[PDB]
Amino acid sequence: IREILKMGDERLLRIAQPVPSELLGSEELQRLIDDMFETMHHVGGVGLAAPQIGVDLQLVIFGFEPAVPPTILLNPRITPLDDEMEEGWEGCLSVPGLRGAVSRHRRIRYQGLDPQGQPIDRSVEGFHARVVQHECDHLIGRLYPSRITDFSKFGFTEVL
Ligand SMILES: CCCCC[C@H](CC(=O)NO)C(=O)N[C@H](C(=O)N1CCC[C@H]1CO)C(C)C
Numbered sequence: 762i763r764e765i766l767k768m769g770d771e772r773l774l775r776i777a778q779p780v781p782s783e784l785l786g787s788e789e790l791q792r793l794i795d796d797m798f799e800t801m802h803h804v805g806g807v808g809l810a811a812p813q814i815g816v817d818l819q820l821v822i823f824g825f826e827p828a829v830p831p832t833i834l835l836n837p838r839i840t841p842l843d844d845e846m847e848e849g850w851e852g853c854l855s856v857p858g859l860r861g862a863v864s865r866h867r868r869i870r871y872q873g874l875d876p877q878g879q880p881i882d883r884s885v886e887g888f889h890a891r892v893v894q895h896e897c898d899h900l901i902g903r904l905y906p907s908r909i910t911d912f913s914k915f916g917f918t919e920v921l
């Protein structure tokens with residue numbers, strides 16, 4: 762288990778470095794991955810990005826049993842597939858006790874590498890696209906409050 766960094770920590774604000782090709786397939790990467798899934802499962806998350814546990818790497822995990830397959834995504838690139846935007850509720854492990862409505866692209870393509878270095882290339886919609894976009898934002902130092910445009914919908918979970 763690792764400790765989840767909280768909003769205000771400068772490490773959530775950095776642009777993350779790519780996973781080097783040296784680490785693809787490695788034991789060391791695999792152990793980081795196991796540690797991430799163990800952390801995410803312990804606190805109930807649907808996703809987790811490496812910088813949230815203080816590892817400066819373009820690596821994300823996500824999934825849950827709107828079903829999203831368990832997935833480990835390295836070095837990602839996201840491409841919006843059209844202009845359609847949708848609002849949905851988000852919260853974040855790094856921003857405990859809050860929720861906010863955020864407008865994200867409805868449809869994206871995402872690509873990157875799996876942990877063995879095999880390419881990933883998928884086009885998704887709705888909740889799956891929302892999760893990817895949230896997680897990838899961590900890799901460019903963006904948390905969801907910096908994406909809100911309707912502040913009438915941002916507030917404490919226990920109030921909302
Ligand atoms: C959909 C927004 C992406 C959520 C990703 C976060 C996990 C996280 O810290 N990602 O880096 C999460 O699991 N958040 C949960 C969350 O936002 N949920 C619970 C299930 C769906 C959604 C509803 O707000 C919890 C912490 C409240």
Ligand code: NI
Pocket residue numbers: 852853854855895899
């Ligand atoms: Ni988050």
